[PDB]
Design a protein around this nucleic acid. Structure first.
Ligand SMILES: Cc1cc(/C=C/C#N)cc(C)c1Nc1ccnc(Nc2ccc(C#N)cc2)n1
Lengths: 533, 412
DNA sequence: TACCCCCCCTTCGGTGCTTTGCACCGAAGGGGGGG
C-alpha cells in the first residue's frame, strides 16, 4: 500500500493508440535494488495484465516509445531569468532534492502503462518515473504546490530548481538563515522529503548557464580569445559568436566589419585573408576584453535609465542602469532593416529593442536618454507617414549626434533651374539611355552599360544633380526614385544611391516632382523620345 | 442547474496553444488580483499541468474609471468555433440600422457570468499569467462560466436574451436592438431626452432580472462618405497643373469618366514650374466636367456579405487619418476621415488605436462584419503599444503594410 | 551525429508593388550560453 499526501495529477494518452512493447556497476544488484524499492513502497507486484516490453547510480529505463504515447503537457518554463533582473541576496544556499523525484505518486490508472517486467518477474512503477516526458512537469508543479504555503508565509525567500537541486535565497544572515533552512526542511518533510547537501552548499560564485552569480554582483564566464595568425571561416564565426555573448556586460563591442568577412565563401575550410579594418576592430574588442567588468543587480526602490550611443557605420550601443556608472546590462544593435534607411529610423528600432527587452526582463519601461534634439524628432516623425512613439525620455549632449543631413522642398523654388529627367532600358540587351533636358535648352544624354530601369532613373537624377546650382528643381517620372529620396536615406546597399545622397548633401535647396509619363504632359515626351534611341 | 449546450470544434482541428506576450508589472498585479477575485466566485478554476492549451491575456481599462478589466484574445478559438456561432447558432443582423438616428452602446458582459460552460469544452479556454523575468512559473486557469470575448457566448445566451428583452421589444416596436459580443446596440429615431429616458428604462428592466451594472450614443446620420474635391486656385502655375494631372490619373481608376485631354494641352512646352499658365475655355470645361463627375456617388460599388472587409488607413499629418473600407480595391464601400481629440502632438499610437476602435465600431454598426485592418505601422511597435490605449472587449484582425504610400490625395 | 530554450549574423524563398526589379519578411544555416 502506497502513501500520497499530495494529490495525483491525472494523465491521459493520445487517443486511438496503446503503449508499445544496461548499466555497468549494477547488473546483478538490480534484483536487490528492485526488492528495496518494493519494500519501501515504491513498487508493487502485478500479474498477467498486459503484454509489454521495456529496456553508485541506479538502473534507468528508457521510455522513448511511450513518450510519444502519453498526452502533451505544459511547458512550465521557457525563458531563462537574466541575472540583471534578479535581486541582491545576502544568503544563497542549495539543498539536495535528487531523491525526491521518486516520491511523487503517479496516477492510479496510469501505473498499468509503466511496467518493467524484464529481469521474467512482475514489476511496475507506482511513482513518477525517470526519463518520462510528463514526469518533469508533474514533479515541478507538485513542488510549486508544496512550496506555495512556505512562500506565502515567507515572501522574501526565493526558490529556484536547477536540475537535482533547490537554490534558496534570502536577505538574512547565515545564523538566521539556518533557522529558515530548518523550517523549510520540516515543511518539505511533512510531505516526506529530506534535503541534506554538502557539496555545493555555500560555494559562490555559482556557474549557472554561463554566468558567475556572486551574492551582490554577476558576470559572464571568461571569454577565450583565439590568437591564431590565420583564421578560417569557422574561426571568425566562433569569434563573432563569442563577442556577441560577451557584449552583454562589455560595452563597445563592434562586430560589423568582422562579420562582413563571412560573405562570398560557403565552405568551412578556406582561410580568408584578413583586412585592415577587421584587424583594427579585433584589436579594439580585445582592448576591452583584457579587463573584466561586472554588473550589479536590480533594485526595486529606484528607477532605471537607458543610454544610447552611436559607433558609426550603422551600429549603436546601449547601457541600462539604475545608478550612474553602476550598470545593469549592456547591449548592441547593428541589424540592417531595409536597403535604404537613415539613422533616426535606426534610433527608433534601437529604442524599440531596449523597451521590449526591459519589458521582458524587468516588466517596466526605462527612461531613455538619446543623442538627438527634440526639434529634429518632431520634424521627422510629424512628416513621416509611419506611426511610432518614443516613451518618456531626455536629450544628452554626446557626439556623434544624429540629424537629417538634407531636407527636401515642398513648393517649387523661384528662379531655380528646372531639370527634366528620364531613363530608358531594354531587359534583354541591358542597354541604357539616361539623360536630362532643361527648359533653358541644356540637353545631356550619356550611353549606359549594365543598368536597369530603376538604376537608370536613379542615375538620371544623379546626372541632373551633377551639373546644376544650389537651387534646383527636378521633375521625374518614377515612383521608385521618389520613394527612395523622400525616405531621406543616409546609407544604401548600392553605390549609386550613396553618390546621389552625397550630391544632395552639397545642394542648398532641392525640389523633386513626379508626374506620370507615357501620357504627353510636359517635357516627359521630349526626353522619352530623346532616350528612346 | 441548467443545460450545458454541447460545444465541439470542427474535426481535424486542434485547440489553441499560442503563447503570451510579456506583460507590464502593473498589468500583471491587476490581472492576478482579478483572477483571484474571480476564483473566489467560482468563475475560473485553477488547472493542473495536464492542460497543454493556452490563450493570450491582457489587462485594459475603460474611460472615466480607475479599475482594470481582463481581456482574453480568442481570435483563434473564434476561428476554430466559427461554425458554432455563425451557421448553427448565428445572430440576425438588421439591414436598416445604419438608417436610424441614434445608436447607444451598452455593456452586457456579466450576463455571461451566470451560465455554466460545457464540461468537455472547459479545457480549451485555458489562460496563463506569466511572471517578471521568467523567474517563477505562471499561474494557469480555465473558465467555468461562459467566456467573455468568445464569439460563441452570444450564440449560447441568445436564448435567454430573447426572453429577457421580449417585453421591452413589445412595448417599443420603434427601436432596433442588436447584440455583438458584450456590446448591445439600441437604435432609435427619438431625441436626446427621450433616448436617455428609454435607456434608463432599459437599464432598470435589466436590473429587474439581475444584470450586474455599476455620450454613449452614436450618430449614424453624420456618417457619410467623404467626397473628393479638387482645390480651386487663384493662380495656376505649371506645378499645380502637374499635380492635378497626377491626381486625376490616379483617380481615373475610381471614376472611369475622368479625362485629362484638355488639361494636357496647356503643358506642351517645357516651362518652369514657377511660371503661371492661364486657363483656356476648353480646359475649364473639362475641369468642370471632372468636378461634376467627382460630385456624384460611386457607380458599380455593391456590398457583398460573402467576402471579407478590408480597411486601409493612411496618416496625412497634423493628426489626420483617412480610412477606406472595401471588399475589392479601388471600389470603396466606405471612405472617411478622422481627427484627434486633444493636444498639439500628444500621441500617435493612441490616435491610431482609438481610430481603429472607431472605424471597427462603425463597420459593426453598418454591416456587422469586422474589417481586416491594414495598419501603417511597424509590427514590433504595434504589438508593444497596441494595448496601453485600447479600450474594447473584443479584438479585430490586422496586417501591416511595410510599403511607403505616396498618395496625398485625400487631405487638402 | 539526436532533440529542445533564449540571443546575433548571413542567406534564401516567397510575396507584393514600387511591377519581371526591388524591397520586405520569416524561415533556415552557422555561431554563443546551456537543457
Ligand atoms: C534564477 C535563480 C537562479 C539561481 C542559480 C543557481 C545556480 N547555480 C539561484 C536563484 C536563487 C535564483 N532565483 C532568484 C530569484 C530572485 N533573485 C535572485 N537573485 C540572486 C541570484 C544569484 C545569487 C547568488 N549567488 C543571489 C541572488 N535569484
Amino acid at each position: 500500500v502506497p502513501i500520497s499526501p499530495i494529490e495525483t495529477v491525472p494523465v491521459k494518452l493520445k487517443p486511438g493508440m496503446d503503449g508499445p512493447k544496461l548499466t555497468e556497476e549494477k547488473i546483478k544488484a538490480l534484483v536487490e535494488i528492485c526488492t528495496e524499492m518494493e519494500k519501501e513502497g515504491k513498487i508493487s507486484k502485478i500479474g498477467p495484465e498486459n503484454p509489454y516490453n521495456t529496456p553508485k547510480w541506479r538502473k534507468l529505463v528508457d521510455f522513448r516509445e511511450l513518450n510519444k504515447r502519453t498526452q502533451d503537457f505544459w511547458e512550465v518554463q521557457l525563458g531563462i531569468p537574466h541575472p540583471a533582473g534578479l535581486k541582491k541576496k545576502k544568503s544563497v544556499t542549495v539543498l539536495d532534492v535528487g531523491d525526491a523525484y521518486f516520491s511523487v505518486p503517479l496516477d492510479e490508472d496510469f501505473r498499468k502503462y509503466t511496467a518493467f517486467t524484464i529481469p521474467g518477474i512482475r514489476y511496475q512503477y507506482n511513482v513518477l518515473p525517470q526519463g518520462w516526458k510528463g514526469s518533469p512537469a508533474i514533479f515541478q508543479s507538485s513542488m510549486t504546490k508544496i512550496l506555495e504555503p512556505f512562500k506565502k508565509q515567507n515572501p522574501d525567500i526565493v526558490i529556484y530548481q536547477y536540475i537535482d537541486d533547490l537554490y534558496v535565497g534570502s536577505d538574512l544572515e547565515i545564523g538566521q538563515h539556518r533557522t529558515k533552512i530548518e523550517e523549510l526542511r520540516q515543511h518539505l518533510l511533512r510531505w516526506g522529503l529530506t534535503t541534506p547537501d554538502k557539496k555545493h552548499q555555500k560555494e559562490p560564485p555559482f556557474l549557472w548557464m554561463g554566468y558567475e552569480l556572486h551574492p551582490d554582483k554577476w558576470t559572464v564566464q571568461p571569454i577565450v580569445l583565439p590568437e591564431k595568425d590565420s583564421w578560417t571561416v569557422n574561426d571568425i564565426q566562433k569569434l563573432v559568436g563569442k563577442l556577441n555573448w560577451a557584449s552583454q556586460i562589455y560595452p563597445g563591442i563592434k562586430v560589423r566589419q568582422l562579420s562582413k568577412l563571412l560573405r562570398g565563401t560557403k565552405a568551412l575550410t578556406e582561410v580568408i585573408p584578413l583586412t585592415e579594418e577587421a584587424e583594427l576592430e579585433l584589436a579594439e574588442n580585445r582592448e576591452i576584453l583584457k579587463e573584466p567588468v561586472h554588473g550589479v543587480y536590480y533594485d526595486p526602490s529606484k528607477d532605471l535609465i537607458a543610454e544610447i550611443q552611436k559607433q558609426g557605420q550603422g551600429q549603436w550601443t546601449y547601457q541600462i542602469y539604475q545608478e550612474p556608472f553602476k550598470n545593469l546590462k549592456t547591449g548592441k544593435y547593428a541589424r540592417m532593416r531595409g536597403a535604404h534607411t537613415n539613422d533616426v529610423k535606426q534610433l527608433t528600432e534601437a529604442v524599440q529593442k531596449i523597451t521590449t527587452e526591459s519589458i521582458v526582463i524587468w516588466g517596466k519601461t526605462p527612461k531613455f536618454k538619446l543623442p538627438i534634439q527634440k526639434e529634429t524628432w518632431e520634424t521627422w516623425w510629424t512628416e513621416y507617414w509611419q506611426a511610432t512613439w518614443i516613451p518618456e525620455w531626455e536629450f544628452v549632449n554626446t557626439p556623434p549626434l544624429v540629424k537629417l543631413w538634407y531636407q527636401l522642398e515642398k513648393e517649387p523654388i523661384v528662379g531655380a533651374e528646372t531639370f527634366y529627367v528620364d531613363g530608358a532600358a531594354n531587359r534583354e540587351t541591358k542597354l541604357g539611355k539616361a539623360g536630362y533636358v532643361t527648359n533653358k535648352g541644356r540637353q545631356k544624354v550619356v550611353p549606359l552599360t549594365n543598368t536597369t530601369n530603376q538604376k537608370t532613373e536613379l542615375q538620371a537624377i544623379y546626372l541632373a544633380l551633377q551639373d546644376s546650382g544650389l537651387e534646383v528643381n527636378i521633375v521625374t517620372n518614377s515612383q521608385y526614385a521618389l520613394g527612395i529620396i523622400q525616405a531621406q536615406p543616409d546609407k544604401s546597399e548600392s553605390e549609386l544611391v550613396n553618390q546621389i545622397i552625397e550630391q544632395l548633401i552639397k545642394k542648398e535647396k532641392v525640389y523633386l516632382a513626379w508626374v506620370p509619363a507615357h501620357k504627353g504632359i510636359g517635357g516627359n515626351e521630349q526626353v522619352d523620345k530623346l532616350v528612346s534611341a | 442547474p441548467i443545460e450545458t449546450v454541447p460545444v465541439k470544434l470542427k474535426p481535424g482541428m486542434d485547440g489553441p496553444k499560442v503563447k503570451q506576450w510579456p506583460l507590464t508589472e502593473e498589468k500583471i498585479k491587476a490581472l492576478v488580483e482579478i483572477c483571484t477575485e474571480m476564483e473566489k466566485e467560482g468563475k475560473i478554476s485553477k488547472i493542473g499541468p495536464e492542460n497543454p492549451y493556452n490563450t493570450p491575456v491582457f489587462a485594459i481599462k475603460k474611460k472615466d474609471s480607475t479599475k482594470w478589466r481582463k481581456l482574453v484574445d480568442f481570435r483563434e478559438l473564434n476561428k476554430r468555433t466559427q461554425d458554432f456561432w455563425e451557421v448553427q447558432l448565428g445572430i440576425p443582423h438588421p439591414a436598416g440600422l445604419k438608417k436610424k438616428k441614434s445608436v447607444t452602446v451598452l455593456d452586457v458582459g456579466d450576463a455571461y457570468f451566470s451560465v455554466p460552460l460545457d464540461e468537455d469544452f472547459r479545457k480549451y479556454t485555458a489562460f496563463t499569467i506569466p511572471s517578471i523575468n521568467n523567474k517563477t512559473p505562471g499561474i494557469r486557469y480555465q473558465y467555468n462560466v461562459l467566456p467573455q470575448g468568445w464569439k460563441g457566448s452570444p450564440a449560447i445566451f441568445q436564448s435567454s436574451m430573447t426572453k429577457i428583452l421580449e417585453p421591452f421589444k413589445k412595448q417599443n416596436p420603434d427601436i432596433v436592438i442588436y447584440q455583438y459580443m458584450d456590446d448591445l446596440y439600441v437604435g432609435s429615431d427619438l431625441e436626446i431626452g427621450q433616448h436617455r429616458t428609454k435607456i434608463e428604462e432599459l437599464r432598470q428592466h435589466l436590473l429587474r432580472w439581475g444584470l450586474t451594472t455599476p455620450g454613449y450614443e452614436l450618430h449614424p446620420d453624420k456618417w457619410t462618405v467623404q467626397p473628393i474635391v479638387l482645390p480651386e486656385k487663384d493662380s495656376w502655375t505649371v506645378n499645380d497643373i502637374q499635380k492635378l494631372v497626377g491626381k486625376l490619373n490616379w483617380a481615373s481608376q475610381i471614376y472611369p469618366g475622368i479625362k485629362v485631354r484638355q488639361l494636357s494641352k496647356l503643358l506642351r512646352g517645357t516651362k518652369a514650374l514657377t511660371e503661371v499658365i492661364p486657363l483656356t475655355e476648353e480646359a475649364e470645361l473639362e475641369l468642370a466636367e471632372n468636378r461634376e463627375i467627382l460630385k456624384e456617388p460611386v457607380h458599380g460599388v455593391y456590398y457583398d456579405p460573402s467576402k471579407d472587409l478590408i480597411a486601409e488607413i493612411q496618416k496625412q499629418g497634423q493628426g489626420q487619418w483617412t480610412y477606406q473600407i472595401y471588399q475589392e480595391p479601388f471600389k470603396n464601400l466606405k471612405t472617411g476621415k478622422y481627427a484627434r481629440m486633444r493636444g498639439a502632438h500628444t500621441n500617435d499610437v493612441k490616435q491610431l488605436t482609438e481610430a481603429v476602435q472607431k472605424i471597427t465600431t462603425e463597420s459593426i454598426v453598418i454591416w456587422g462584419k469586422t474589417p481586416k485592418f491594414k495598419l501603417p505601422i511597424q509590427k514590433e511597435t504595434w504589438e508593444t503599444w497596441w494595448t496601453e490605449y485600447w479600450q474594447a472587449t473584443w479584438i479585430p484582425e490586422w496586417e501591416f503594410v511595410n510599403t511607403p504610400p505616396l498618395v496625398k490625395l485625400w487631405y487638402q
